[PDB]
Amino acid sequence: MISLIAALAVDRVIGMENAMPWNLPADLAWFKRNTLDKPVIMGRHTWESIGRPLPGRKNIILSSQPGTDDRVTWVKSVDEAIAACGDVPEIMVIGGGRVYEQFLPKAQKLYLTHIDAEVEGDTHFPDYEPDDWESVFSEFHDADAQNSHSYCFEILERR
């Protein structure tokens, strides 16, 4: 199956100028717990903002262009990206906005982190209609001396 994972601020802001405007490490641990030993598909701008490969995962980059780094796999369409994952239990789509938009219809599960922050951004997660989605898990955390916002983890599965 295909799953999307994303961290959303208020009004579904997911980014600004390609950046990590928030250093919330509990959500990073959640991201790694849920993408470890799976293929991860990302768009080229998200690849350039991560800065490096994510180790322990098959990194597949969508770009209309050929490869600029042979440490990762390059694909030039959605059909090719899914094919390049091979037969697996779960394909993780890790953004960004343009890529989330395209894989939402082909998505059976959402891993969403909702962060209590406002950050005047320039990229937004898809405005699905949640009627098509059921929440199957919601785990809320208040701020700590390590994460300076409250956040909810949510898993949503297509009904």
Which positions lie near ligand NAP, rule CB under 6 A?
Answer: 6-7, 14-15, 18-19, 42-46, 49, 62-65, 76-78, 94-99, 102, 123
Tokens of residue 155, six digits: 């898993």
Shortest Cβ 41–ligand NAP spacing (Å): 10
Maximum pairwise Cα distance, the chain: 44
28 binds ligand FOL (CB under 6 A): yes
Shortest Cβ 37–ligand NAP spacing (Å): 20
* Sign of the CA dihedral with 84 first, then 50, 15, and 133 last: positive
Instruction: Determine whether the annotation assigns residue 97 to a binding site.
Output: yes
Shortest Cβ 150–ligand NAP spacing (Å): 16
**Which segment (29-37, 74-82, 121-129, 130-138) binds ligand FOL by CB under 6 A?**
29-37
Strand pairing category for 91-93 and 109-115? unpaired
Q: Which does 32 bind (CB under 5 to 8 A by kind): ligand NAP, ligand FOL, none?
A: ligand FOL
**DSSP letters for 21-50:** ----HHHHHHHHHHHTTSEEEEEHHHHHHH
Using a CB cutoff of 8 Å and minimum separation of 24, what contacts does 53-60 make? 57/92, 58/85, 60/84, 60/85
Cα separation of 2 and 127, whole Å? 18
Give residues 83-102 in contact with ligand FOL (rule: CB under 6 A): 94-95
Whether the CB-CB separation of 25 and 132 falls below 8 Å is answered with: no
Binding site: which residues? 5, 7, 13-19, 27, 45-46, 52, 57, 63-64, 76, 95-102, 113
Binding residues vs ligand FOL (CB under 6 A): 5-7, 27-28, 30-32, 46, 50, 54, 94-95, 113
